Structure formats: C-alpha cells, structure tokens
Amino acid sequence: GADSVKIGFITDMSGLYADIDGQGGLEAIKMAVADFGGKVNGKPIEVVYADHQNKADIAASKAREWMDRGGLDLLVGGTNSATALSMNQVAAEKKKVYINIGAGADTLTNEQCTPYTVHYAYDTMALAKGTGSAVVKQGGKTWFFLTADYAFGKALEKNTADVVKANGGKVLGEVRHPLSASDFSSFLLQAQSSKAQILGLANAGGDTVNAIKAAKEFGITKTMKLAALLMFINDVHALGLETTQGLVLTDSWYWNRDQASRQWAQRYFAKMKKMPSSLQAADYSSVTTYLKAVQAAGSTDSDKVMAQLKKMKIDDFYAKGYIRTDGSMIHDMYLMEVKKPSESKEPWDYYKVVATIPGEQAFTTKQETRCALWK
Numbered sequence: 001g002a003d004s005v006k007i008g009f010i011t012d013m014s015g016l017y018a019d020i021d022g023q024g025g026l027e028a029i030k031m032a033v034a035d036f037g038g039k040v041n042g043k044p045i046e047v048v049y050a051d052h053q054n055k056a057d058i059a060a061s062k063a064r065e066w067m068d069r070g071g072l073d074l075l076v077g078g079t080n081s082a083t084a085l086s087m088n089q090v091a092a093e094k095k096k097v098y099i100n101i102g103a104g105a106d107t108l109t110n111e112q113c114t115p116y117t118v119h120y121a122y123d124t125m126a127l128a129k130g131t132g133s134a135v136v137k138q139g140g141k142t143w144f145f146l147t148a149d150y151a152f153g154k155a156l157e158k159n160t161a162d163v164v165k166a167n168g169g170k171v172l173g174e175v176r177h178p179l180s181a182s183d184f185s186s187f188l189l190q191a192q193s194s195k196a197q198i199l200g201l202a203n204a205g206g207d208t209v210n211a212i213k214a215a216k217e218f219g220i221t222k223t224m225k226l227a228a229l230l231m232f233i234n235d236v237h238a239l240g241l242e243t244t245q246g247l248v249l250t251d252s253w254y255w256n257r258d259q260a261s262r263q264w265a266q267r268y269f270a271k272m273k274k275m276p277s278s279l280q281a282a283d284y285s286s287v288t289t290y291l292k293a294v295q296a297a298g299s300t301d302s303d304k305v306m307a308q309l310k311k312m313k314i315d316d317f318y319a320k321g322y323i324r325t326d327g328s329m330i331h332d333m334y335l336m337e338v339k340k341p342s343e344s345k346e347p348w349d350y351y352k353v354v355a356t357i358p359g360e361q362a363f364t365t366k367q368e369t370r371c372a373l374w375k
Contacts, residue, residue, distance in 0.1 A: 001006045001071020004046040007033070007287065008066045008319035010059050010087065011078020011102055013051035016180045016206030019234040021079045021102045024272050025283040029076065031267065032287035040294050052083045054179065059083035063090045072096060073300040074290050076283065079205070081105035081152035083236040087323055091116050095302050097309075099290060101282045104204070104230065105155040109326040110370035116302060117327040118309060121282035122252045122288075122314075126362040127229050128159035130335050134354070135198055135227050136167040138248075144196035145174035145222075146187055146211060156229055157202040164200075172196045180206060184214040191218050204230045216243055232277040236338060236350045244338040244350075251334055253278035253318055254351050260317040274349040285318030306337070321359060323338030330359040 009029055013022045026049050033045045048066065052059040059080075066072040067090065075091055077084050079098035090137030091098035092114035099118040100108060104121040122292055143164050147153040153176070161171045175190045178371040188211070191199050199220065201208055213222050228235075231249045255265035255275045264284070268276040293308035294300055315319045316331065321331035344350065366374065 001073070003048075004071065005040055005043050005045065005294065006066070006070060006072050007045065007072075007074045007076060007290075008063070008070070008072050009012055009047065009049045009078060010052050010062055011049075012054050012080055013049075015054050016103070017054070017079035017204070017239075020205055020232040020277045021279045021283070023260060023272065024268075024274070024280045025078060025102070026277065027271055028268065028280045028284040029287050031121050031271070032291070033356065036288060040291050041298060041300070043174055043290070045357065052078075052080065053079050054083070056080075056082040056086035060086035060090050063087045064094075067091075067094045067096050070112040071176040073145075073294075074099065076101065076286065078102035078283075079279070081107070081155065082150050085112060085151055087119055088112055088114060097290070097302050097305050099286045101286055103152065103280050105151050106159060106364060107151065107155055109328045110364060113326050113371035113373055115373065116306060116332035118286070118323050118329060119327050119352040120286045120329045121279060122250075122333070123328070123363065124156040124159045125364045126333050126357070127250050128163045129157060129362060130333055130357055131227060131229055131248055132160045132200075133167060134248050134335055135225075136164055136169045140198040140225060140227065141169045142196045143169060143171045143198045143200060143227075144191045144194040145171070145200045145202050146184075146191055147174050147176050148207055149176040150179050152204065153202045157200070160200055160202065160229055162258075174202075177203070177207070184211050185218060188215055188218055188220050193221065196224060198227050200227045201229055203232055205232070205235065209235050212243065232279065232304065233275060233348065233350060234277055235339045237274075237348070238282045241339055241341045241344055241350065245340045247338045247357050249336055249338070250357070251278050251336060251351075252331065253281045254334065254336070255281075256349060256351070257334075258354075281318050285316050286312070288316060317327075324366070326374045328363050330363060331356040332359045333362040
C-alpha cells in the first residue's frame with residue numbers, strides 16, 4: 001500500500017482445517033512480522049486476514065478486493081486447494097506475489113503454474129512419492145482410494161495412483177466423499193468389498209480423522225492397512241497414538257526434529273498452548289522469506305520481489321532450500337512412522353523418522369512437469 005507493506009492471509013479458520021493452520025497460522029505470521037522488526041523498506045508492515053470458510057469464491061473475492069483497494073503486497077494462501085487455485089488465478093492476473101502454504105495440490109506448480117506463485121511447504125507429488133512409494137515397497141501392492149471430492153483429493157489420488165502403478169502395484173478402485181463428510185460408513189464398506197491391501201486416504205484434516213475413527217470402528221482395519229496420505233500433528237493428537245501407531249506419513253517439519261525446531265516451537269506454544277504443525281511453522285518461515293526478499297530488493301514491486309525470491313537461499317528453523325522456476329520451494333521431506341504409546345516420552349512426541357527424502361527427489365521432476373513455464 002501507500003503507507004504500509006500489507007500481508008494478507010486467507011485460510012479456513014472455522015472448519016475441518018482450522019486446527020492444523022487457522023488462527024495458529026495467523027499468530028505465526030504476526031510473530032514473523034514482529035520478529036523481523038515490524039517494518040521493511042522504511043514502511044510498517046500490516047497483516048490482514050480472512051476466513052474463506054472453505055469457499056473458493058470467498059477466497060478469490062477477498063484476494064481481489066485486497067489487491068485492488070487494500071494495497072496488498074503479499075497474499076499468503078492457507079488451506080484448501082480449491083481456494084488455493086481460485087486465489088492463484090487472481091494473483092497471476094494482477095501480478096501480485098502469492099505464497100501458498102496450507103494447500104497441497106501440485107496443480108499449483110504444474111497445469112496452473114504462474115510466474116507469481118510460490119508453493120512453500122508440501123505438495124501432493126511429495127506426499128505420493130513419500131508415503132506411496134514406502135507402502136508399495138513394504139508390500140502394500142493393491143490399493144483402493146477414499147478421496148475427498150474436490151481439487152485436493154483428485155490431485156492426491158492421481159499422484160498416488162501413478163506412484164503405486166510405477167512401483168509394481170495395482171489400483172482396484174476409488175470412492176469419493178464430500179469435503180467434511182458427516183458419515184463415512186457406505187464409502188468404507190465399498191472400499192472393504194474391493195479386497196485391496198491398502199486403503200489410501202486421499203483427504204485431510206477432520207476428514208482424515210473421521211475416516212480413521214470410522215475405519216477402526218467398523219473393523220475395516222482388521223482386513224486393510226490405512227495409508228494416511230496427509231496427516232498433520234493435530235490429526236494424531238485428535239486420534240491418539242493407540243489408534244495411529246505404525247502409520248507411515250510424509251511431512252515437511254516436526255517440532256522435535258532438532259534444536260532450532262524445538263526452540264521455535266517453544267515460542268509458539270508460549271502463545272497458543274499447542275505444538276505447531278508443519279503449516280504453522282511454514283507460515284512463519286514464508287513471511288520471513290518474503291520480507292528478506294523485499295528488504296534485498298528495496299521494493300515491493302512484484303517482478304523485483306519474485307526475482308529476489310528465485311535467487312536467494314532459504315535457511316531457517318523451518319527449512320534449507322530455494323524457490324525454483326515452477327514456483328516450488330525445494331526442501332527435504334521426512335518419511336515418519338507414528339509412535340506406539342510406550343515410545344512417546346513427552347506430550348506431542350509422536351514421530352519416528354524413517355527416512356529423509358532429499359528435496360531434489362521429493363517433488364515433480366523436470367521430465368514429468370506439466371508446468372508450461374519450465375522447459
């Protein structure tokens with residue numbers, strides 16, 4: 001804006017994704033602003049926010065209004081890939097810097113890649129390549145998908161099905177459920193009748209939690225192993241270790257990884273009284289990264305900031321990495337296994353690291369890209 005550098009954050013603050021990002025993510029953004037000193041290029045930094053209520057149209061209309069009449073300099077995209085994609089289009093049209101953290105669809109750096117988009121934390125290709133490969137390599141050869149009926153589920157099912165098939169496995173079928181489904185019983189029985197070895201949960205947040213609860217309840221887990229293709233620390237906390245032990249998952253960050261992660265998590269906890277998820281961590285990091293780019297450019301001009309973003313290393317408590325041509329922030333990913341209750345040594349101690357997946361190997365390869373800007 002004229003008087004301020006304006007950061008806007010749009011995410012689900014009220015529904016099935018609120019705990020994993022939501023208000024906590026907003027808090028993390030405000031801490032990053034304060035920690036940077038509250039100003040950049042001699043202008044105060046102002047944060048605005050909105051709850052998209054899991055509506056792509058709300059997200060896109062708010063973004064447009066802030067860009068056109070609110071002097072927006074950075075749009076931070078939160079959860080829900082339908083909202084991520086509607087916002088992406090607005091940012092590309094208006095030539096405004098857009099960093100998406102909470103949403104997963106790899107579409108953002110592929111079919112719908114833009115010169116103004118950064119996909120910061122994770123995507124559905126990394127999920128598939130991590131958890132999908134690992135489960136198939138362990139002998140989980142036959143799969144049936146339970147898929148959230150919107151852009152995220154569809155993208156994740158496609159990436160994961162492709163990995164399964166590439167690694168000698170077979171996909172027997174899929175069943176769709178509405179976002180934030182109130183009843184999973186008929187869907188789970190269809191999956192059970194398929195006789196697949198693996199039930200791939202191509203869904204997230206409250207859907208993942210409710211589906212796992214329902215699967216354990218209806219006895220689905222007697223005959224099928226669940227592959228939780230996207231699970232955050234809050235989802236484990238909701239379900240408990242007794243139910244989640246042994247699940248393999250792919251994530252970008254965990255509070256207890258190392259000294260630097262723990263120290264930041266302590267500052268977060270001191271405010272929110274929960275351990276942060278990888279999204280809440282990434283929210284803070286992405287703001288630091290943006291502000292460093294504005295500081296180095298001496299400008300909020302979107303072409304100058306994008307050029308800075310694409311030439312600066314990132315190295316903070318969240319990640320070491322860089323932002324490449326297609327917009328992906330390349331950083332190592334982690335294959336983890338959920339602990340047994342007896343292995344958990346303090347509150348929120350949920351993960352065993354199985355493997356580190358190198359950044360260059362975790363995301364879409366040059367040869368397989370659908371990004372028309374990456375040749």
